[PDB]
Amino acid sequence: MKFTVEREHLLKPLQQVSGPLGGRPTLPILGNLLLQVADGTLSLTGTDLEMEMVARVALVQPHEPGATTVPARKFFDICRGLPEGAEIAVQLEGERMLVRSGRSRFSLSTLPAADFPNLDDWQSEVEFTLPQATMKRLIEATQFSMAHQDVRYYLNGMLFETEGEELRTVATDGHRLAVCSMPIGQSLPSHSVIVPRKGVIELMRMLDGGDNPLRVQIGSNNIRAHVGDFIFTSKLVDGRFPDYRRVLPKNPDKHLEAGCDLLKQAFARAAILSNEKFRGVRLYVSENQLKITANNPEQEEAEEILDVTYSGAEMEIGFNVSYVLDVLNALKCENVRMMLTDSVSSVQIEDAASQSAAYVVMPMRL
Template sequence: PTVEEGPGSLTFNLVQSKLRRLIERTSFAMAQQDVRYYLNGMLLEVQSGLLRAVATDGHRLAMCSMEAVIQQEGKHQVIVPRKGILELARLLTEQDAEVAIVLGQHHIRANTGEFTFTSKLVDGKFPDYERVLPRGGDKLVLADRQGLREAFSRTAILSNEKYRGIRLTLASGLLKIQANNPEQEEAEEEIVVDYSGSGLEIGFNVSYLLDVLGVMGTEQVRLILSDSNSSALLQEADNDDSAYVVMPMRL
């Protein structure tokens, strides 16, 4: 299909490895076969100097931004289908080479000289992700990412296979992680964290937490919570370009 280079289309160049990182950090949160078809893909939002990728399946949300040389008044949003995004990430193999992106009315095109990739866009309205981002969480936890990941992985083994629920109990300097399953088996882990606020008990789908920790790169992770009914915000401790939201679970 031809991508209209006409009015309303937008062209910009990105370093391949940076675009690939943007996709890899967010694509896991895309829905797979949701009736809300616009969730089965990734939102790419461009504004002057910035490209942002957002994906959500209604239970969790992933967002990552990168600086880019883009001339654009206001914000322009497109939704790229799931299959297209995964294929594009697979094609971006050159570390430092650039890829030229053209956003048309109904298509996206990526061109590197080695390949030209074209995908239809999803015709739909993506949810307002700004409203999903939790604001005003007063419980800030700093933890070792790898230690947390290993503790979650061990606890997950005894969580309910269908619902994957784990219970987090937060106290000063300590995070307790518990899981049980219909066979009455129980797992409990304790991990030392940097936290000095009041206590909190909250449930999560452990798979969603592991997905987030798996794409992060820093040693320390920042977890911001408010109460047991509010979503958690996860970020790398020293890096603000990505944000992850995970909804709580009733246990």
């Protein structure tokens, strides 16, 4: 195996296939990158045995086919540390990979490519394309509502659902939920899968905000995403994910509208004097007014009063203010709508000018 590639044509793929900072790995070889030269292409692969990242680099300079594996971080750091425009010449010498550029020389330990884990081929059952910006919006809208290392593994992931011409994400941890839907202009089969946290992170990381579209393929136990000359694949998560349709309050009779930032800053200040564990705040809604209160065990108290748009019946309700602040921070908009029912029911929160995303927060008895 031999190749010579310009620094700039290696750096991006090497970064693409790096994956998360974890370790120590199950096998030593999982800390290595698989390098394969065949048919005029260098392929670079990283895996943790469940997800896999593969980049392809066309080789315009002379090259010889073959494969090896090398320490991923060291190889990347070497390439990154070389000067702009550097010609990175790679070859094998016994059990080492030689990397040479100008008067810089490196010798890295290898492990056999034949020993690198090859995940099984699988069959696509659902396929669609969408802009990178749409995937970005879908994941960012909901990601914060995924559970955190819950024993119910399925809540730690994110639902991806096709219905009609829309892709939808749902995330929930039992206490609050987020759902976002976006049209992608294709007739889709009705289907849903659960992508694990680590897969969601990589789906986000692979977006570069350039013009390449995202091509997705869903199998029975896997999902693949292609962007340019990069492929990411992840296992799916088993389990039945909650139906968002059952979580949206059935028929909220009361609607409140307010400036997002004004509302956010009022909750943020009140939150300072809320219980550090339970984070409870109380809302009192009245004609065009919201009063927010908070107190903690040492009897410190916050009160905020705001003008808002509200003509419904007066009511009182408690919420975990972190959950509310999470939502207002994910809504990146001028005005918000809160859809209420009563003090023992959930609230739905949305951009006042868009129903693309909805958020549900359950009340607290206070």
